[PDB]
């Protein structure tokens, strides 16, 4: 759900 995924 967060960035960098």
């Amino acid at each position, epitope marked *: *759900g*967060x*960035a*960098g*995924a």
Partner: antibody, heavy 117, light 114 residues
Framework: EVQLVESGGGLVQPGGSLRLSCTASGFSIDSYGFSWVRQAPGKGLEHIGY???????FYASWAKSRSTITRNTNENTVTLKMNSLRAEDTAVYYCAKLGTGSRFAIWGQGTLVTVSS | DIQMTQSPSSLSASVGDRVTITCRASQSVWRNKFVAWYQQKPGKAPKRLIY???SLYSGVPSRFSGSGSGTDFTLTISSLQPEDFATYYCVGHYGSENDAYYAFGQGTKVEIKR
């Protein structure tokens, strides 16, 4: 219950390095991304870097050249290393899932690192 | 880099006052959604009150509420109570599919007028 226990910290000579770790209790460190954050005495909060849940570390530009954030899935810890420290790195250091867009948030208790001869 | 700004930096208010604290990010936050509001009192660690712009965490008084979109966000305290004088921080998440950052605002200190 659920906890994030922070350890390390203390005195660092200028040019030296700090090593801080947080041990998760009641959940798995692999499950979430964790930040490191600091607060110099009487100043505001400052982001250092982030280790995604996938295990990739990104850093604030000011911290990238000196900082390494890793995790140990076996011991359930996340760790911050910073080298080449200077006086202005004196601060309370926190590990935290900041919870900006998700319901889970948790912080370590904070520990003081003083950089001085 | 990424930068966030709160207005005002310092606020004097009375109990019962309506309080509004704004926060502007230098670029849109992750999914236009990843902003939280924290409360910090002297000698204490930061406590999170709101997340995902407008969601309140269990146990957080309903007088606190959050709004905004994209680059602009607002913390509202409908009726300031004695336990609410503290410093408030907005905190945003940013990045790409191979990028991830966070930034804090500078903090807004809410003190009691007399």
């Amino acid at each position: 219950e659920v906890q994030l226990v922070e350890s390390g910290g203390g005195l660092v000579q200028p040019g030296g390095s700090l090593r801080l770790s947080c041990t998760a209790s009641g959940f798995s460190i692999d499950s979430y991304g964790f930040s490191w954050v600091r607060q110099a005495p009487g100043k505001g909060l400052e982001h250092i870097g982030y280790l995604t849940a996938g295990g990739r570390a990104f850093y604030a530009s000011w911290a990238k050249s000196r900082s390494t954030i890793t995790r140990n899935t076996n011991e359930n810890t996340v760790t911050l290393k910073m080298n080449s420290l200077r006086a202005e790195d004196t601060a309370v250091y926190y590990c935290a899932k900041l919870g900006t867009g998700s319901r889970f948030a948790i912080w370590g208790q904070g520990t003081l690192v003083t950089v001085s001869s | 880099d990424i930068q966030m700004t709160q207005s005002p930096s310092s606020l004097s208010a009375s109990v019962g006052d309506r309080v509004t604290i704004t926060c502007r990010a230098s670029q849109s936050v992750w999914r236009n959604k990843f902003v939280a509001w924290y409360q910090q009192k002297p000698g204490k660690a930061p406590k999170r009150l709101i997340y995902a712009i407008a969601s309140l965490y269990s146990g957080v008084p309903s007088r606190f509420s959050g709004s905004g979109s994209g680059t602009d966000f607002t913390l509202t305290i409908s009726s300031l109570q004695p336990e609410d004088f503290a410093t408030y921080y907005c905190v945003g998440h940013y990045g790409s599919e191979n990028d991830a950052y966070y930034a804090f605002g500078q903090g807004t200190k809410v003190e009691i007028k007399r």
